[PDB]
């Protein structure tokens, strides 16, 4: 038993991290086959960060201006092109450690692991969730750009995130691996504000089920509710409206415990209205919303990679 | 910016996980150079778990009774022995992925990452801390035995923990890599109690420092305290006595923030007596005690491996 915020093992991804330098800017890149992916703002100086014309800067660069470093070895850049906000450096060597991989765009409420890197080497691994305002709550310092987020299914790594920027509230924003930002963000040094976020209700419900699976059951009551009466309360607390698709997604966890989803909604409704009265659930004093229903099933059943 | 519960990158350890089977029992092993380490109770049946005579059980086995599998390739066992509660299986092949490594024994209050495995393949990675009752609060299912806990310093892997068993409150117990249990636990299926645990005061203070570094300041107040008056308060709330060694250890974090340690102690003291008033600190509604002072500095400075 037990239930922890659990990251995917990062080995398959560590073997893909390199260091990309362009003039005096250094950040991380992702080396897959014979292409290195990194944020296009590697070609900027600190000066032209206010309003950079990336296409214009790129036409002034040559292949030898991009220094790519895998560990201690220099890779040789033989081509480059720009795709939205990512740079793609063709190098003359295919990464022998390249895993099976896809580039995917996740939806708000989905989770992934982050391998935080500096100078092409790994610092730490952690979980976070794509929020409804298209930010994430990560831990990123200077030089962390180009670190990636990913999921692993069997042996295939699904790359979903590449880090680009921090926002005023201490949250973070990035692109998919096609260079498209999540949310209304751009890679410029202008004032950008995240936007208002909601609690991922379907994840809170999943986590309560995880709690039941682990014997934490003080919060269960004998009541039921409807989607309407629940969403009335949920809206007051800035929780995302629960849909029947959400109820269906919670099906597997509902059957494993024998607690109908609307019965669990009645427990969440009471938790939201009465607080937690100084108590905890799975060692937490607040309601956790960064475990997907898949996360719970994965951790509570023992799936490996 | 941001502060997360962060695990060490797990690549170096992933290359060491193998699958060890003996009869109908399968668990995980750690393959370093030409030796595989795993819990000795891989040799028990479900029957003889009440009071296993391991020496008697071991002498009945030969090398070819130990099925060891690194990924999909079968290893050849050419010797075996027992050292306390770990089994050492000598194989004819040195693990080509062996990292630089040490075996260390961690002390209560230190942290490490756990690479949880099933059937010899890595499933997820998470941080936890050795509790003063010699338990950890992990996430372990049937078949996770043989999973190891570890820290990384630059390039060296320090193996500190191998998983063995679950205890009454849903917590976990294991050995170091010489097979010596942490705490008053034995590898038998008998009534064993963890013992009473305390909150790791020096870690709470370190995390309060991380909060200030990351812009969370509302808990700083106009007070100071002394070690003696603080320890009067901590004892009531089942916190570990704070020592002068603890004060000195928090020194670097104290200098980085310009908040004297005894001033931060006065902030913890008021938090303990009056709670948090519906506010949070680093997105947590309770006081976190599983970041050591070293974890905080390391995460906030960007140290890589
Ligand atoms: C990113 O470029 C990086 O990791 N490394 C490049 C680098 C910078 C400095 C020294 C060596 C190498 C950084 C990562 C940021 C910095 C701290 N935490 C992060 O996530 N990304 C940016 O600097 C980013 C570049 C923009 C997208 C093109 N950037 C520039 C200017 C402002 C901000 N945001 C900001 O000012 O934050 C607030 C909270 C509003 C003060 C920004 O993210
Ligand atoms: C460990 O052996 C393992 O991971 N795999 C062997 C295996 C078991 C079942 C099916 C296939 C393979 C487990 C790990 C445990 C199991 C679930 N969560 C864990 O952390 N260790 C044991 O099962 C352990 C073996 C004992 C040390 C020699 N064991 C056996 C019987 C009972 C318990 N604990 C227990 O009863 O918990 C309480 C809370 C007291 C009810 C036990 O840990
Ligand atoms: Cl063989």
Swiss-Prot record, chains A, B:
Residues 1-305 are cytoplasmic. Residues 1-305 form the Peptidase C30 domain. Inhibited by pyridone-containing alpha-ketoamides compounds 13a and 13b. In turn, alpha-ketoamide 13b (tert-butyl (1-((S)-1-(((S)-4-(benzylamino)-3,4-dioxo-1-((S)-2-oxopyrrolidin-3-yl)butan-2-yl)amino)-3-cyclopropyl-1-oxopropan-2-yl)-2-oxo-1,2-dihydropyridin-3-yl)carbamate) inhibits SARS-CoV-2 replication in human lung cells. Inhibited ex vivo by michael acceptor inhibitor N3. Inhibited ex vivo by compound 11a and 11b. It is found in: Host cytoplasm; Host Golgi apparatus; Host nucleus. Signal peptide: none annotated. It comes from the Viruses. The active site is at residues 41, 145. It catalyses: TSAVLQ-|-SGFRK-NH2 and SGVTFQ-|-GKFKK the two peptides corresponding to the two self-cleavage sites of the SARS 3C-like proteinase are the two most reactive peptide substrates. The enzyme exhibits a strong preference for substrates containing Gln at P1 position and Leu at P2 position. There is a cross-link at residues 5, 90 (Glycyl lysine isopeptide (Lys-Gly) (interchain with G-Cter in ubiquitin)). Cleaves the C-terminus of replicase polyprotein at 11 sites. Recognizes substrates containing the core sequence [ILMVF]-Q-|-[SGACN]. Cleaves and inactivates human TRMT1, preventing tRNA guanine(26)-dimethylation of tRNAs. May cleave human NLRP1 in lung epithelial cells, thereby activating the NLRP1 inflammasome pathway. May cleave human GSDMD, triggering alternative GSDME-mediated epithelial cell death upon activation of the NLRP1 inflammasome, which may enhance the release interleukins 1B, 6, 16 and 18. Also able to bind an ADP-ribose-1''-phosphate (ADRP). 3CL-PRO exists as monomer and homodimer. Only the homodimer shows catalytic activity. Interacts with host FBXO22; this interaction promotes the proteasomal degradation of nsp5. This is 3C-like proteinase nsp5. The chain holds residues 3264 to 3568 of 4405 of the full protein.
